[PDB]
Amino acid sequence: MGSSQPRKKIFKPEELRQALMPTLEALYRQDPESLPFRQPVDPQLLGIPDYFDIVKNPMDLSTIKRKLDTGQYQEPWQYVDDVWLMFNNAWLYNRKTSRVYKFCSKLAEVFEQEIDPVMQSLGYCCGRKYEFSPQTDTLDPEPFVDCKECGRKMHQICVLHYDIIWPSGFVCDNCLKKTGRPRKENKFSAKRLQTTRLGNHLEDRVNKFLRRQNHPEAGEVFVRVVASSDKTVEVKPGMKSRFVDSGEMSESFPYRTKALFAFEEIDGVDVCFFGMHVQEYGSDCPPPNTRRVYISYLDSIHFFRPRCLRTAVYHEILIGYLEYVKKLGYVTGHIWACPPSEGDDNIFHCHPPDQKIPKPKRLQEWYKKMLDKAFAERIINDYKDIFKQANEDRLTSAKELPYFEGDFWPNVLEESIKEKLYATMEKHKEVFFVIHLHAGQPPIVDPDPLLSCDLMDGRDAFLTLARDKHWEFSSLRRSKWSTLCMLVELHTQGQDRFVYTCNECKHHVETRWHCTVCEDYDLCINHTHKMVKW
Numbered sequence: 001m002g003s004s005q006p007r008k009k010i011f012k013p014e015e016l017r018q019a020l021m022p023t024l025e026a027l028y029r030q031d032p033e034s035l036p037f038r039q040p041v042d043p044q045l046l047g048i049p050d051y052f053d054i055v056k057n058p059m060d061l062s063t064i065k066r067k068l069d070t071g072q073y074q075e076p077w078q079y080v081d082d083v084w085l086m087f088n089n090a091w092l093y094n095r096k097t098s099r100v101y102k103f104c105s106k107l108a109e110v111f112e113q114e115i116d117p118v119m120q121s122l123g124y125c126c127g128r129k130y131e132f133s134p135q136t137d138t139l140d141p142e143p144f145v146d147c148k149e150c151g152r153k154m155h156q157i158c159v160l161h162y163d164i165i166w167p168s169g170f171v172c173d174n175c176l177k178k179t180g181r182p183r184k185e186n187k188f189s190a191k192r193l194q195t196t197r198l199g200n201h202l203e204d205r206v207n208k209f210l211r212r213q214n215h216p217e218a219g220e221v222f223v224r225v226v227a228s229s230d231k232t233v234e235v236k237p238g239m240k241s242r243f244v245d246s247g248e249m250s251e252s253f254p255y256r257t258k259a260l261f262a263f264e265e266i267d268g269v270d271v272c273f274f275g276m277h278v279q280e281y282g283s284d285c286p287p288p289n290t291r292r293v294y295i296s297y298l299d300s301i302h303f304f305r306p307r308c309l310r311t312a313v314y315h316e317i318l319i320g321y322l323e324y325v326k327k328l329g330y331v332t333g334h335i336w337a338c339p340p341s342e343g344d345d346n347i348f349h350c351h352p353p354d355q356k357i358p359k360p361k362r363l364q365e366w367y368k369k370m371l372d373k374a375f376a377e378r379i380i381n382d383y384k385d386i387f388k389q390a391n392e393d394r395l396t397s398a399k400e401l402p403y404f405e406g407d408f409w410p411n412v413l414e415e416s417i418k419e420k421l422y423a424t425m426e427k428h429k430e431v432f433f434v435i436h437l438h439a440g441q442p443p444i445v446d447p448d449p450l451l452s453c454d455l456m457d458g459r460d461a462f463l464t465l466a467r468d469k470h471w472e473f474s475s476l477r478r479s480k481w482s483t484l485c486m487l488v489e490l491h492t493q494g495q496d497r498f499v500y501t502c503n504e505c506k507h508h509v510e511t512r513w514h515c516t517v518c519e520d521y522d523l524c525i526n527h528t529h530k531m532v533k534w
């Protein structure tokens with residue numbers, strides 16, 4: 001039952017009383033807001049019988065003062081926890097409209113204002129009591145990591161320590177500077193993730209843009225394709241009995257799905273801010289889907305450091321994609337511009353509450369804004385809504401409009417099972433976009449291999465994992481931890497197991513040479529660049 005920290009930091013009652021008293025004093029200094037808290041709550045004075053059936057562990061400034069004065073706190077966190085218990089009791093019994101609730105919120109704002117730097121000066125991260133967002137009476141706490149050398153407990157998310165990266169345990173920032181050796185660099189980074197021709201093109205597109213701007217807060221951006229696989233869309237049994245039972249359209253359609261993410265350095269750490277799953281139907285795919293792409297899902301977390309260039313870099317990513325698929329041989333883009341349902345996430349588990357979900361018109365206008373700039377850039381020849389293309393290119397049969405996986409139309413055709421379908425086309429005409437890469441020969445060849453990654457094969461896997469692991473994207477601090485964890489998941493959970501080969505030799509070798517300039521220059525001496533003995 002007993003533990004052993006020989007060099008553990010203990011605070012004498014007067015050392016913590018010296019440091020924690022200013023913070024408690026600042027609360028008492030707030031008149032009249034601290035007045036219903038300066039003494040314990042009295043249900044007989046207030047006519048509130050049910051108080052002790054709601055608040056089970058009462059707390060108030062006076063009890064916290066008595067504990068502080070008579071040294072009943074051994075380490076700061078017991079003080080910190082008791083104030084938040086008093087605050088949490090007020091937010092509980094008193095309604096959000098209440099004066100006491102507002103009074104409590106003011107005290108809490110001043111507690112946050114003072115407690116953070118005092119805890120920081122005493123070798124801690126912050127003085128806040130954190131909890132995870134509710135899922136599905138009782139909430140989940142934030143994890144803590146105890147310093148190996150000093151024993152000081154810290155919020156795991158504050159300090160960004162994950163064991164799988166640093167297995168020698170966690171040692172606090174100041175302990176490392178007492179020895180004179182800085183922390184061991186995180187190798188599970190976005191920059192280190194497997195480079196792909198597509199991702200490189202997209203990150204060049206955004207890095208050249210912000211290089212031209214030279215914005216102060218702007219951090220380096222990394223776009224990586226984390227999963228790439230060959231999937232198949234099977235035609236639904238309804239439309240299958242009308243066109244597949246004959247020979248008008250194929251029973252299935254081949255596409256390559258690719259999940260891809262965008263990351264940026266914020267305070268020297270990787271923060272993920274953009275997600276996107278696409279469907280690419282190649283040259284050997286039967287009609288209608290031949291040579292077309294389809295943005296299946298897209299998501300974002302608004303913590304992009306220079307908040308001004310935020311939508312400029314989202315648009316530059318979306319435009320770099322179209323410049324890429326077009327260049328290698330695709331002809332039409334397809335976006336179902338629909339926002340997510342209330343309280344539902346596309347890719348990133350827990351969105352920030354202060355992050356505004358655009359209205360369907362705003363989303364259409366945002367996509368519209370992106371496409372016009374790409375037209376001027378001479379990437380997209382032209383674009384039109386689904387109705388202005390089914391009547392310009394003359395469509396009369398169901399088999400003529402593209403059939404994508406999880407798209408609206410493949411499921412709406414199944415609804416017309418008892419019977420007007422061209423009438424549904426102009427109702428939602430602004431939602432569906434048809435992009436033209438070419439106006440009007442050799443087959444497509446994706447140079448990139450296939451990234452096998454179960455977590456990014458479909459949105460559901462990453463969304464469910466983060467939900468169980470509590471990897472939220474609700475705060476910048478919480479997004480930094482969720483990115484830290486998702487990067488180790490993509491690294492360690494790497495389903496692809498490599499077999500390296502040399503370039504000029506073309507042999508499967510174990511001992512090799514790798515220069516510090518090219519992307520993957522492996523060579524067998526059995527070139528101008530300086531090689532490394534790997």
Ligand SMILES: CC(=O)N[C@H](CCCCNC(=O)CSCCNC(=O)CCNC(=O)[C@H](O)C(C)(C)COP(=O)(O)OP(=O)(O)OC[C@H]1O[C@@H](n2cnc3c(N)ncnc32)[C@H](O)[C@@H]1OP(=O)(O)O)C(N)=O
Nearest residue numbers: 295296297298299300311336337338339340356357358359
């Ligand atoms: C059956 C079924 O399940 N069916 C489903 C159907 C799924 C359909 C398939 N979906 C797709 O294919 C994807 S199309 C896009 C989907 N939506 C999303 O990506 C999620 C929303 N979040 C975002 O990623 C971003 O908002 C983004 C779209 C990237 C635009 O970035 P932004 O930078 O432009 O921000 P803003 O929020 O638009 O607005 C930018 C400004 O507008 C402000 N703003 C935004 N919305 C509002 C608003 N509501 N009220 C007031 N202001 C508002 C915001 O505060 C801000 O201001 P500031 O510049 O001062 O900061 C199924 N199959 O699963």
Ligand SMILES: [Zn+2]
Nearest residue numbers: 125126155158
């Ligand atoms: Zn903390």
Ligand SMILES: [Zn+2]
Nearest residue numbers: 147150172175
């Ligand atoms: Zn320490």
Ligand SMILES: [Zn+2]
Nearest residue numbers: 215306308309
């Ligand atoms: Zn700006």
Ligand SMILES: [Zn+2]
Nearest residue numbers: 502504505524
């Ligand atoms: Zn060789």
Ligand SMILES: [Zn+2]
Nearest residue numbers: 515517518529
């Ligand atoms: Zn080289």
